[model samples]
Target: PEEVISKIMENPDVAMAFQNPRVQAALMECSENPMNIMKYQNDKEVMDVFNKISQLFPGMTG
Candidate 1:
């Protein structure tokens, strides 16, 4: 399961999103404290990038 996530993380589409430093920072912060994700939820720019990435990896365990 973990390896599958790592594999998906290397995707080119994700790379494109990562090109935006804001996205990178948002993800970095959320990774450390997932609850912080809500902060970005109201941020359209960040959420746009997140929506793109999330589509690539569905079934995210809540």
Candidate 2:
């Protein structure tokens, strides 16, 4: 999710949780926008990020 997809490639678990039901969620065209995203460093956080990105929203942040 950086300049390249290496960071995500290294961590497959971070991006493999939402592969089951695959019910909702949509993708639209957009440009890169920097978001100092306090997202997904651990298993728990990763789940949150997946959920937020799933429903097309920002992850819960403090």
Candidate 3:
């Protein structure tokens, strides 16, 4: 979901929405959802998903 969230962040409209505390809180809650276990896995699929998500933020990676 990181990729999805990052893509949303790239959008000026969505980014502005994210600035609201309520929106940020919702995102944080979603991130901690147990159903998103794939994101925490170290399998190839998980890595691929993370890579795709990271692409949403160009030059943002360290």
Candidate 4:
């Protein structure tokens, strides 16, 4: 998940998805410490969040 986030972080378009309200809310809720965010615990959970974020902006996922 960290690798995925790192790749997305490098791309302006993909990174901008984090600015969306839905993505932001989901991230805030899924993260343990909202202040110090980290990657999802498992691949399934990471994919789930990616799916939700993708829904907000189509074609964002690989």
| Per-residue lDDT over 1-62 for candidate 2, one digit per residue giving the tens place of the 0 to 100 score | 45333444544653453343221121111122222222223345444645555344345221
Top lDDT prediction, candidate number: 1
Each model's number of backbone clashes? 0, 0, 1, 0
Query: What TM-score goes with each of the models?
Result: 0.57, 0.24, 0.37, 0.36
How far out, in Å, is residue 14 in model 1? 3.3
How far does residue 19 in candidate 3 sit from its true spot (Å)?
0.4
Model 1 deviation from native, Cα RMSD in Å: 4.0
Q: Which is the winner by lDDT between candidate 1 and candidate 4?
A: 1
Task: Give the winner by lDDT: 1 or 2.
Answer: 1
Give the lDDT of residue 46 in candidate 4. 44
How close is each model in CA RMSD to the real structure?
4.0, 10.2, 9.5, 9.9
Q: Write the per-residue lDDT of candidate 1 for residues 1-62, one digit (tens) a residue.
A: 46544665677766676677778789779777757668888877788778766675567644
Taken over the whole model, the C-alpha lDDT of each candidate is: 0.71, 0.36, 0.51, 0.56
Please give the range of 10 consecutive residues that has the lowest summed lDDT in model 1: 1-10
Off by over 4 Å in 4: 1-8, 32-49, 52-62
Candidates sorted on TM-score, descending: 1, 3, 4, 2
Instruction: Name the lDDT value of residue 24 in candidate 1.
Output: 74
Global CA lDDT computed for model 2:
0.36
